């Protein structure tokens, strides 16, 4: 019932709190049916899922290197010897727009060639921000000038958080007729966090904005009275 002993202090460290590579994006390289794209571009988003978004927004500033792992397979989970190209498009570089775009040959775009039959390809993306740390909260406007725009977008959107894109394609010459599902797993390494914040209590409405619904949900579940247990 009761544990009279003390646990470990290391399991509560920030480094351990953000460990354990988790799913950050599920992209599909569609190459069949009505979408013969043969490629897909995934903008690196650490906050694609509200769980990881809430965990990250515990801190204001975070600095970390990221290890990305790509678990790719077909719809029937099979992994034939199809050769894939996982091209990392760094921030500021143009992304591909076609299966055979010239951007796939850009040598400055670090590219990983691996077959579906291979173990999941795995790379380390360093800390890519112009600032000294990523900002999950940026109380400001990246533009320059007066900000009386009617729909006040661009507020709170830090431009320094851009980590790049992962353009994935088959190395085919034409459509293969097979859709490939790529699960992108990202591990936070050497994480350092600053300025802890309250954990988000209201449900996330949209991405990139802390907008919450007009119906405020109480942080605590209700009781019958202030004296009941």
């Amino acid at each position: 019932r009761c544990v009279m002993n003390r646990n470990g202090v290391n399991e509560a460290s920030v480094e351990h709190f953000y460990s354990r590579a988790g799913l950050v994006g599920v992209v599909e390289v569609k190459d069949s049916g009505t979408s013969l794209d043969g490629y897909t571009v995934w903008p690196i988003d650490v906050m694609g899922f509200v769980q990881q978004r809430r965990k990250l927004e515990l801190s204001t500033y975070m600095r970390f290197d990221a290890e990305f792992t790509f678990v790719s397979n077909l719809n029937n989970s099979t992994t034939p010897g199809m050769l894939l190209q996982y091209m990392y498009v760094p921030p500021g570089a143009p992304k591909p727009d076609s299966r055979k775009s010239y951007q796939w040959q850009t040598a400055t775009n670090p590219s990983v060639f691996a077959k579906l039959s291979d173990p999941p390809p795995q790379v380390s993306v360093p800390f890519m921000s112009p600032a000294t740390a990523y900002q999950w909260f940026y109380d400001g406007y990246p533009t320059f000038g007066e900000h009386k725009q009617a729909t006040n977008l661009q507020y709170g959107q830090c431009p320094n958080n851009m980590m790049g894109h992962f353009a994935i394609r088959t190395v085919s010459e034409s459509t293969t007729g097979k859709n490939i599902h790529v699960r992108v797993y990202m591990r936070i390494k050497h994480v350092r966090a600053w300025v802890p914040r309250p954990l988000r209590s209201q449900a996330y409405m949209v991405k990139n904005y802390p907008t919450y619904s007009q119906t405020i949900t109480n942080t605590a579940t209700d009781r019958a009275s202030i004296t009941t247990t």
Binding site: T60, Y61, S129, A131, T132, A133, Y134, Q135, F137, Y138, D139, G140, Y141, P142, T143, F144, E146, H147, K148, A150, T151, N152, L153, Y155, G156, N160, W194, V195, P196, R197, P198, L199, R200, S201, Q202, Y204, M205, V206, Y209, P210, T211, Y212, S213, Q214, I216, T219
Partner: protein, 241 residues
């Protein structure tokens, strides 16, 4: 009780200086970086780093609270406002002194917290596709020197619970025991310098947790005075306009 005189400004405050130091860090001048090794940013004296006493907010029974974005709260105020409006880069700490003038027959409690990167959230009735109701207007994100009254103080107008706002550098103003809160916030940013007009490094919230109460005859509104003193302010890239 003493009289702190900084520059030509003098405030009446009590001694013993029960000051909250944000994250145990004193505001310091940034060590000369490569961008600053060539221009030697302007470090103004007590002419700028003086006491700025804003207009007093009237704490009433139904007041939800106020907040001030601090690089913005002094952008149009005196010589600090001049230096902020006409410099490209800016960096400063702040000493914030929130004072209430309440009798011993008034009651209530204020939570005075300094929230770094206090990103204000909009409260939309429903998820509409990228509409105006999804983002706060500039009047709410940068309320200026008049501050902004909280719409939903329970969620800090940011979706985070007010009950956990104490994770930030905070100070209680419980009218029965004290009526002054002093928070010293150093420059906290992912950059050594930044734009004073675009980026608000932090917001200072003054939220009544326990609502103001009084019996008939007492002053129906407790004045809340906010005195601001920039500490170790630096500026770079002077314009003319």
């Amino acid at each position: 009780v003493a009289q702190l005189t900084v520059g030509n400004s003098t405030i009446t405050t009590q001694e013993a200086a029960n000051i909250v130091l944000s994250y145990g860090e004193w505001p310091e001048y940034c060590p000369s970086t490569d961008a600053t090794a060539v221009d030697k940013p302007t470090r103004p004296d007590v002419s700028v780093n003086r006491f700025y006493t804003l207009s007093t907010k009237s704490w009433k029974t139904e007041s939800t609270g106020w907040y001030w974005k601090f690089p913005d709260v002094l952008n149009d105020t005196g010589v600090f406002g001049q230096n902020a409006q006409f410099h490209y880069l800016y960096r400063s700490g702040f000493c914030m002194h929130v004072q209430c003038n309440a009798s011993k027959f008034h009651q209530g409690a204020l939570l005075v917290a300094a929230i770094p990167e206090f990103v204000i959230a909009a409260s939309s009735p429903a998820t509409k596709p990228n509409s105006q109701g999804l983002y706060p207007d500039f009047a709410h994100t940068n309320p200026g020197k008049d501050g902004q009254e909280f719409r939903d103080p329970y969620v800090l107008d940011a979706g985070i619970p007010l009950s956990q706002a104490l994770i930030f550098p905070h100070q209680w103003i419980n009218l029965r025991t004290n009526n002054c809160a002093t928070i010293i916030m150093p420059y906290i940013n992912a950059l050594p310098f930044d734009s004073a007009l675009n980026h608000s490094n932090f917001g200072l919230v003054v939220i009544p947790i326990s609502p103001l109460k009084y019996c008939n005859g007492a002053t129906t509104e407790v004045p809340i005075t906010l005195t601001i003193a920039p500490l170790n302010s630096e500026f770079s890239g002077l314009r003319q306009a």
